[PDB]
Amino acid sequence: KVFGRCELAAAMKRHGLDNYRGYSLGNWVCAAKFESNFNTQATNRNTDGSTDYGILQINSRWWCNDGRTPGSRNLCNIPCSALLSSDITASVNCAKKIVSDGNGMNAWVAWRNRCKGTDVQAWIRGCRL
Ligand SMILES: [Cl-]
Ligand SMILES: [Cl-]
């Protein structure tokens, strides 16, 4: 599923991401834009043999099981395929664990490089939330 911008904002808000660990909703929308283009089905192989999955490009080395990643810990206790669903519940739950890991949203490279320090509120402008 490719979410609309405000559609994804509303889903993330309903799932409790707005201000989660102090990160306003626009941060999460911005991260998803640059990680996945709001596409739940996005996958990308990493150089180390892991793969990133879903709207927030969650990695198979620590977070989810994809059956093919060396050193996998599956800390979210979910198959990586669950992170590709049109229902973002599993991605949100796992993202909550990731953002609580100590480095906040710096865990998402695209967030640090493209969202951090910018007017992230722009990502929710116009939405009825
Ligand atoms: Cl915001
Ligand atoms: Cl933080």
Give me Rg for the CA atoms of the chain: 14
Q: Which CATH architecture has domain 1-129?
A: Orthogonal Bundle (1.10)
DSSP string, the chain: -B--HHHHHHHHHHTT-TTBTTB-HHHHHHHHHHHHTTBTT-EEE-TTS-EEETTTTEETTTT-B-S--TT---TT-SBGGGGGSSS-HHHHHHHHHHHTSSSGGGGSHHHHHHTTTS-GGGGGTT---
Residues with a known catalytic role: 35, 52
Enumerate the domain spans of the chain: 1-129
- Only one residue has tokens 């994809």, namely 66
Contact in structure between 59 and 35 (CB atoms under 8 Å): no
Instruction: Starting from the CA of residue 17, give the closest ligand.
Output: 1
Cα 84 to averaged position of ligand 1 atoms, centre (Å): 25
Binding residues for substrate: 101
Cα 106 to averaged position of ligand 2 atoms, centre (Å): 8
Q: What is the resolution of this structure in A?
A: 1.2
- Bridge-based pairing of strands 43-45 and 51-53 is antiparallel
Q: In angstroms, rounded to a whole number, what is the distance separating the alpha carbons of residues 123 and 23?
A: 13
Cα 19 to averaged position of ligand 2 atoms, centre (Å): 11
Contact in structure between 109 and 96 (CB atoms under 8 Å): no
Residue 106: other Cβ atoms inside 10 A: 12
